[PDB]
Amino acid sequence: MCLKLNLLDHVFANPFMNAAGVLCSTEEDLRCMTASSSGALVSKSCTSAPRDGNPEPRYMAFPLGSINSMGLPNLGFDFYLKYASDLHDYSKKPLFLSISGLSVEENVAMVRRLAPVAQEKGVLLELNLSCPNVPGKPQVAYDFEAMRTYLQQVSLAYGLPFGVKMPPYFDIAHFDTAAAVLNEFPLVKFVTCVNSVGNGLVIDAESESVVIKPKQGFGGLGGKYILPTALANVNAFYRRCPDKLVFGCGGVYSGEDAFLHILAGASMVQVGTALQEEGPGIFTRLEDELLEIMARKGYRTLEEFRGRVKTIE
Amino acid sequence: MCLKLNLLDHVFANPFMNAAGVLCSTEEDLRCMTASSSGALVSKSCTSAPRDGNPEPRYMAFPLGSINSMGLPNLGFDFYLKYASDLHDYSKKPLFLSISGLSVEENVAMVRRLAPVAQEKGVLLELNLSCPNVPGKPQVAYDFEAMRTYLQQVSLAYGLPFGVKMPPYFDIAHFDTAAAVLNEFPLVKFVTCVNSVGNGLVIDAESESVVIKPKQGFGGLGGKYILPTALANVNAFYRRCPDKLVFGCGGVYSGEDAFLHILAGASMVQVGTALQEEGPGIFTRLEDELLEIMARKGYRTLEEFRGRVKTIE
Ligand SMILES: Cc1cc2nc3c(=O)[nH]c(=O)nc-3n(C[C@H](O)[C@H](O)[C@H](O)COP(=O)(O)O)c2cc1C
Ligand SMILES: Cc1cc2nc3c(=O)[nH]c(=O)nc-3n(C[C@H](O)[C@H](O)[C@H](O)COP(=O)(O)O)c2cc1C
Ligand SMILES: *C(/C=C/c1ccco1)=C1C(=O)NC(=O)NC1=O
Numbered sequence: 001m002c003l004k005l006n007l008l009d010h011v012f013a014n015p016f017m018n019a020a021g022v023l024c025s026t027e028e029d030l031r032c033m034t035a036s037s038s039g040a041l042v043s044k045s046c047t048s049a050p051r052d053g054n055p056e057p058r059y060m061a062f063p064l065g066s067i068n069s070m071g072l073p074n075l076g077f078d079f080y081l082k083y084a085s086d087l088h089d090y091s092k093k094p095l096f097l098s099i100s101g102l103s104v105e106e107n108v109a110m111v112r113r114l115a116p117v118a119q120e121k122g123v124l125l126e127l128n129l130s131c132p133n134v135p136g137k138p139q140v141a142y143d144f145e146a147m148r149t150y151l152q153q154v155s156l157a158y159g160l161p162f163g164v165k166m167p168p169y170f171d172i173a174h175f176d177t178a179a180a181v182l183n184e185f186p187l188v189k190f191v192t193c194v195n196s197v198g199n200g201l202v203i204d205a206e207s208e209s210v211v212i213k214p215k216q217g218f219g220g221l222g223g224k225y226i227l228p229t230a231l232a233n234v235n236a237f238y239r240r241c242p243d244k245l246v247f248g249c250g251g252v253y254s255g256e257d258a259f260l261h262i263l264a265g266a267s268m269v270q271v272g273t274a275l276q277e278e279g280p281g282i283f284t285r286l287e288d289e290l291l292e293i294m295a296r297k298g299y300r301t302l303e304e305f306r307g308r309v310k311t312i313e
Numbered sequence: 314m315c316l317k318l319n320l321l322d323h324v325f326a327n328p329f330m331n332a333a334g335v336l337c338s339t340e341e342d343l344r345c346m347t348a349s350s351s352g353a354l355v356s357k358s359c360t361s362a363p364r365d366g367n368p369e370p371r372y373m374a375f376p377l378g379s380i381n382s383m384g385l386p387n388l389g390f391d392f393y394l395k396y397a398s399d400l401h402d403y404s405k406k407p408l409f410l411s412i413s414g415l416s417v418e419e420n421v422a423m424v425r426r427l428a429p430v431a432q433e434k435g436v437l438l439e440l441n442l443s444c445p446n447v448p449g450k451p452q453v454a455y456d457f458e459a460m461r462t463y464l465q466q467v468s469l470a471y472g473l474p475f476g477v478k479m480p481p482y483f484d485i486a487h488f489d490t491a492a493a494v495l496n497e498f499p500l501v502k503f504v505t506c507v508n509s510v511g512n513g514l515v516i517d518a519e520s521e522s523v524v525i526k527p528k529q530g531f532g533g534l535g536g537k538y539i540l541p542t543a544l545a546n547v548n549a550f551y552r553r554c555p556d557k558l559v560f561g562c563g564g565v566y567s568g569e570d571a572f573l574h575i576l577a578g579a580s581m582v583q584v585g586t587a588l589q590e591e592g593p594g595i596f597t598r599l600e601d602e603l604l605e606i607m608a609r610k611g612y613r614t615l616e617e618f619r620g621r622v623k624t625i626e
């Protein structure tokens with residue numbers, strides 16, 4: 001058995017990709033993700049100018065997942081754009097480029113320059129509206145009027161299909177409002193659910209200390225902690241956005257977890273924490289495990305079960 | 314070594330209590346909590362009139378925690394007031410009564426009636442502003458203006474010290490706003506952080522089905538999933554509300570987990586999912602495990618380490 005997605009006028013070998021921020025900062029990282037068996041890759045969220053990020057330690061992992069306060073760090077937009085325009089081998093797999101400007105004007109500036117490269121090469125924009133680790137600059141998609149302004153301005157400057165990296169929500173009214181804002185924008189063709197569960201806090205009992213340095217130890221959560229939250233957000237936006245794709249992200253360590261994301265509605269499945277911890281070998285494992293679950297159940301295609309999670313009575 | 318606390322004009326043998334909703338709905342449940350080694354108990358959140366709650370199954374537990382959509386179920390306010398007035402043995406431990414009206418008016422109606430019993434018996438009010446399982450009635454404390462209205466009306470009607478059960482927040486701006494609301498009310502003497510992480514979704518891979526019946530499977534998360542979220546909220550409010558007490562709730566299975574809550578700023582420590590799964594014998598275990606950690610560290614009292622989590626640099 002194999003798989004075949006045809007999403008966003010691109011062909012994908014399988015639904016797996018990295019999560020933005022993991023194994024995708026440097027040229028070396030991007031070449032490693034390209035050489036892996038993932039179906040696609042996404043670059044690290046960038047600002048217009050290069051930045052260093054927050055002070056170390058800024059990422060820590062544990063048996064149930066990870067906490068991070070990475071904050072700015074990226075080589076800057078010029079580098080990721082060059083990667084997209086001159087360096088990426090599109091014959092190997094599709095590329096997504098993630099942007100996370102600090103203001104609407106910064107995002108607009110970047111997308112005006114990305115557009116020609118999108119037209120020429122087919123790089124796909126993921127607009128990050130959910131970073132939980134910039135002090136003073138909370139998650140844009142938690143402010144629905146701000147979200148609307150960003151999407152209006154980006155859609156007008158960019159003019160081409162794009163997607164949005166969403167924070168998790170926890171309230172039905174918020175699902176309803178958020179999805180309705182997204183559905184105002186026809187150029188938003190995919191929605192990635194979710195970014196990290198923001199501003200958790202891990203404490204080490206022995207040392208009586210937080211484990212990351214920035215923001216008094218507060219950071220976004222990934223990994224096993226977040227799987228039910230991720231699944232809820234995938235399914236909530238899958239139900240509410242029938243004319244868009246939903247990409248799942250959060251808590252994927254196995255083909256079974258991927259299967260659950262796809263049952264909830266996911267088209268592509270992104271891997272963050274588990275990829276940071278296991279490395280890019282994880283992609284052959286996840287595909288082998290997903291194909292085995294499909295074979296046991298008699299599923300030949302992803303379409304046979306995507307979004308087909310059952311409810312009770 | 315000592316687990317004793319003296320707070321809110323009451324003496325507690327230890328900081329442990331049930332979380333509202335767990336082992337506290339019937340008279341039988343309340344007697345069993347009273348008979349346990351807990352330092353206190355809290356009654357099931359009540360509405361003015363009795364309710365049945367949502368269709369079953371409405372609670373499920375897993376190795377990493379639980380999901381629930383209990384929704385309304387309670388014997389009604391009259392029953393819990395009667396228990397406070399006539400049945401509870403205050404010589405054994407203090408009682409908290411949780412209320413969760415569906416409107417500000419219903420809450421106000423209850424607290425007007427509670428007030429004389431609080432005064433006479435010393436029962437303590439916990440006002441629930443965070444239930445994630447009523448369709449059309451999202452978490453009140455996610456709407457800061459609604460929160461303020463409720464606290465103003467309840468403060469005026471009740472006129473006595475009370476506490477509030479808060480939802481988890483995920484955004485620094487939300488912590489700042491929420492705490493500033495709470496700090497407008499001097500009668501809010503304690504803040505319980507946190508209620509369930511709302512609107513998660515658990516899916517069973519074999520059956521391809523959600524595991525609870527209401528709300529298409531969506532429900533609030535407890536247990537191991539939520540400990541870093543709970544610690545963050547406890548510390549965020551501990552830092553922002555220096556004139557109030559913070560009670561910790563979320564993810565407690567061990568004395569070590571309780572130690573982390575206390576380092577983060579918790580006074581009382583509430584136990585939901587783990588008590589639902591293990592039963593009331595958990596409180597002797599939690600006490601022994603917390604005293605073991607204190608002995609190893611040389612700590613003689615809770616106040617020697619409460620709120621003393623260390624940050625880096
Ligand atoms: C070290 C690290 C850095 C991250 N940086 C970004 C980022 O640049 N852009 C972004 O959209 N998400 C970022 N994220 C969030 C992840 O893309 C993903 O949404 C999150 O980790 C949850 O998925 P998981 O449970 O597989 O980790 C980052 C996560 C980690 C762990
Ligand atoms: C079966 C069940 C019923 C609950 N009912 C209530 C409730 O009536 N009032 C309330 O404030 N919280 C209620 N909760 C939330 C818990 O008090 C607690 O905040 C949550 O379960 C997180 O703690 P934990 O990680 O120890 O489970 C309920 C939780 C469960 C599991
Ligand atoms: C923040 C995004 C940061 C960034 C820096 C340059 C451009 O964007 C993060 C995010 O979105 N999710 C995370 O879990 N961690 C982050 O630091």
Ligand SMILES: *C(/C=C/c1ccco1)=C1C(=O)NC(=O)NC1=O
Nearest residue numbers: 358359383384385413444446509
């Ligand atoms: C909802 C509150 C239910 C209630 C019933 C009578 C009055 O209020 C819940 C809550 O606060 N937390 C939960 O985890 N579960 C609930 O269903």
Ligand SMILES: C[As](C)(=O)[O-]
Nearest residue numbers: 023024025026029
């Ligand atoms: C995320 As990296 C460039 O330290 O593998």
Ligand SMILES: C[As](C)(=O)[O-]
Nearest residue numbers: 277278279280281
């Ligand atoms: C050495 As290993 C845990 O990458 O099999």
